Design an enzyme around this catalytic site. Structure first.
Site, PDB file in Angstrom:
ATOM      1  N   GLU B 357      49.324  29.646  32.419  1.00  0.00           N
ATOM      2  CA  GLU B 357      50.469  29.355  33.276  1.00  0.00           C
ATOM      3  C   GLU B 357      50.654  30.434  34.337  1.00  0.00           C
ATOM      4  O   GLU B 357      51.045  30.139  35.474  1.00  0.00           O
ATOM      5  CB  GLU B 357      51.733  29.208  32.431  1.00  0.00           C
ATOM      6  CG  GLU B 357      51.691  28.056  31.438  1.00  0.00           C
ATOM      7  CD  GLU B 357      51.661  26.698  32.114  1.00  0.00           C
ATOM      8  OE1 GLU B 357      52.143  26.590  33.261  1.00  0.00           O
ATOM      9  OE2 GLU B 357      51.152  25.738  31.497  1.00  0.00           O
ATOM     10  N   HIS B 487      45.035   8.216  29.914  1.00  0.00           N
ATOM     11  CA  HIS B 487      44.709   8.203  31.336  1.00  0.00           C
ATOM     12  C   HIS B 487      44.382   6.799  31.829  1.00  0.00           C
ATOM     13  O   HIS B 487      44.601   6.491  33.006  1.00  0.00           O
ATOM     14  CB  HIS B 487      43.540   9.148  31.618  1.00  0.00           C
ATOM     15  CG  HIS B 487      43.855  10.591  31.373  1.00  0.00           C
ATOM     16  ND1 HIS B 487      44.161  11.085  30.123  1.00  0.00           N
ATOM     17  CD2 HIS B 487      43.910  11.647  32.218  1.00  0.00           C
ATOM     18  CE1 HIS B 487      44.391  12.383  30.209  1.00  0.00           C
ATOM     19  NE2 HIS B 487      44.246  12.749  31.469  1.00  0.00           N
TER      20      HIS B 487
END
EC number: 3.4.17.23
Lengths: 50, 595
Positions: B357, B487
């Site tokens: 991150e 997906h």
């Protein structure tokens, strides 16, 4: 969001040193004349800050 | 008075007008994710509706600007990114039905239903359930039953819905003066208008095939090793010549093979490099973890965190006082404020997720020096790879013992290194053939190479030939097997992970050779190297203003997507696999369906 402070963004020419402008006419970027209203190339000169 | 001046004026106006709306939408989304209430959801929905209305309004004025009379590449790219019609060139009823199908498929995939037979209860949702039953269990019967139920209940039920979705997507792609939907998805890596650095839209398929042709030996050796280690666990269930079953891959879809580390560990008596217990014995928290991550990032050349990063980020779970999602997300507000939403624990995986991150935030601050239409990575895989390479380089024992986690007197045995390399292989390369096969199936079903029927037949024949997986139960032409993923049921691409995998090893090798480090790549730490940090910072500043080929040439020195770094990284493990597979059979064969 504080929309009290604005700034001029669109102009047709450069300003002189120590010059202040008060007129807020709409900018024209194209050959079409802006008849006081916004359009394709007729944008507002003053823009607010966030 | 010319077209260039009007285009620049419109671009500046749009960039100045959309920044405030994007910041307000991001703030509403942050308030929703950090506080689940009845008002935050309404505010987020209103912000999303306003953003959608603004994006739809600022598209017709941008489409009027021609693109064949432009000499600036940046303005042309910004207009191409702004004039994206998408779902606008269609009919009202067609678009409404497409949105309804998308919404109902998303709801069906998100809700889920177990509904075990002879049991009027225990019909759970995507919450804890069949996940750990397919991940950390050793029973064949329940795994086969779960793999059959998840594919038969959330399968053929969405077959006509998926057919209509594919048809409508192909119609939308062909109505936008472009090719089929597969070409529309491949156009993300398209580079035009640049002499020498131009990248054809169809060359991506050839590059992926050429990389997979060289990945094939490593994946075959890994599959042979996994089969050899699995035959000792399931007697009379897997042949040393046949292919591995589907429900014995440690995953519902067989994507990740991380759950097979406890069964395929060569040296079960050697401990891992888990330093989780070493941090809990002393004063350590999420704040100290983020401070160490910032110290590691600044040791390479990356700038420090912003002032608002330490006063707005919620690095600690507040508890039952309020509901907040603990999913690690990188927020890019766009106005100098960057914060990370993550309930960082004192575990080991969170230690690398925090660095991931932080690398995302570093890339955001790097490309934040561009207009709003360019404040993003080069492609859909670079933004994740920038943090992934840091997370991989930060999990080294040398860095842990230099910080103070691992003991300095700890010896670096080769068994632990082999185990770590095998774990990295199982967690990285285990999904590359599956991703390649799924992407090729999507391309062939969107272009038109596959007829309306014989979808599952070709799917299984590719999963048997290309991949080393075989189905335990035969499925007819009525079931819908490929639509069991997230997906595919939500219109998300999959080649981004493959590109990130092919780019992370290149970036690691480049940043290791830029620091004048000798030895293997798996122990090369990116620390105390200002030249590599400066090169990475100069490369991240490109973003969408320059093509990705120029960025790869500036960070590595290649104009294409190569796989040789992956081979150079896995050679210490590839040689060990070759030495261990001497008294076994390498590869797999077809015509071995357990029917």
């Amino acid at each position: 969001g504080n929309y009290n402070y604005l700034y001029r963004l669109f102009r047709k020419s450069n300003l002189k040193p120590f010059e202040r402008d008060i007129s807020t006419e709409i900018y024209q970027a194209g050959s079409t004349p802006c008849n006081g209203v916004e359009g394709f190339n007729c944008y507002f000169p003053l823009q607010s800050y966030g | 008075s010319t077209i260039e001046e009007q285009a620049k004026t419109f671009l500046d106006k749009f960039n100045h007008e959309a920044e405030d709306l994007f910041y307000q939408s991001s703030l509403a989304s942050w308030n929703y994710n950090t506080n689940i209430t009845e008002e935050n959801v309404q505010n987020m929905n209103n912000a999303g509706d306003k953003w959608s209305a603004f994006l739809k309004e600022q598209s017709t004025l941008a489409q009027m600007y021609p693109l064949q009379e432009i000499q600036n590449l940046t303005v042309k790219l910004q207009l191409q990114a702004l004039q994206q019609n998408g779902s606008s060139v269609l009919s009202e009823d067609k678009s409404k039905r497409l949105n309804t199908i998308l919404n109902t498929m998303s709801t069906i995939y998100s809700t889920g239903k177990v509904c075990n037979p002879d049991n009027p209860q225990e019909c759970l949702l995507l919450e804890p359930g069949l996940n750990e039953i397919m991940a950390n269990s050793l029973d064949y019967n329940e795994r086969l039953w779960a793999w059959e139920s998840w594919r038969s209940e959330v399968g053929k039920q969405l077959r006509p819905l998926y057919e209509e979705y594919v048809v409508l997507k192909n119609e939308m792609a062909r109505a936008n003066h472009y090719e089929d939907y597969g070409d529309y998805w491949r156009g993300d890596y398209e580079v035009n208008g640049v002499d020498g650095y131009d990248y054809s839209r169809g060359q991506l398929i050839e590059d992926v095939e050429h990389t997979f042709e060289e990945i094939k030996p490593l994946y075959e050796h890994l599959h042979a090793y996994v089969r050899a280690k699995l035959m000792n666990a399931y007697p009379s269930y897997i042949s040393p010549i046949g292919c591995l079953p589907a429900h014995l891959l440690g995953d519902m879809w067989g994507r990740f093979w991380t759950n097979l580390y406890s069964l395929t560990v060569p040296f079960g008596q050697k401990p891992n490099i888990d330093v989780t217990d070493a941090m809990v014995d002393q004063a350590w928290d999420a704040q100290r973890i983020f401070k160490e991550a910032e110290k590691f990032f600044v040791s390479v050349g990356l700038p420090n965190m912003t002032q608002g990063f330490w006063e707005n980020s919620m690095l600690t779970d507040p508890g039952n006082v309020q509901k907040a999602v603990c999913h690690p997300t990188a927020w890019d507000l766009g106005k100098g404020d960057f914060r990370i939403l993550m309930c960082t624990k004192v575990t080991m995986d969170d230690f690398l997720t925090a660095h991931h991150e932080m690398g995302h935030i570093q890339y955001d601050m790097a490309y934040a020096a561009q207009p709003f239409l360019l404040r993003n990575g080069a492609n859909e895989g670079f933004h994740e790879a920038v943090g992934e390479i840091m997370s991989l380089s930060a999990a080294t024992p040398k860095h842990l013992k230099s910080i103070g986690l691992l003991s300095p007197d700890f010896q670096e045995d080769n068994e632990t290194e082999i185990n770590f390399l095998l774990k990295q292989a199982l967690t990285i390369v285990g999904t590359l053939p599956f991703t390649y096969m799924l992407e090729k199936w999507r391309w062939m079903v969107f272009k038109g190479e596959i007829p309306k029927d014989q979808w599952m037949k070709k799917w299984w024949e590719m999963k048997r030939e290309i991949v080393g997986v075989v189905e335990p139960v035969p499925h007819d032409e009525t079931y819908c097997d490929p639509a069991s993923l997230f997906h595919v049921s939500n219109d998300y691409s999959f080649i981004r992970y493959y590109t990130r995998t092919l780019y992370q090893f290149q970036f690691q090798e480049a940043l290791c050779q830029a620091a004048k480090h000798e030895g293997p790549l798996h122990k090369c730490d990116i620390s105390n190297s200002t030249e590599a940090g400066q090169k990475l910072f100069n490369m991240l500043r490109l973003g969408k203003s320059e093509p990705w080929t120029l960025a790869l040439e500036n960070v590595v020195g290649a104009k294409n997507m190569n796989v040789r770094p992956l081979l150079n990284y896995f050679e210490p493990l590839f040689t060990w696999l070759k030495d261990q597979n001497k008294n076994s059979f390498v590869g797999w064969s077809t015509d071995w369906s357990p029917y």
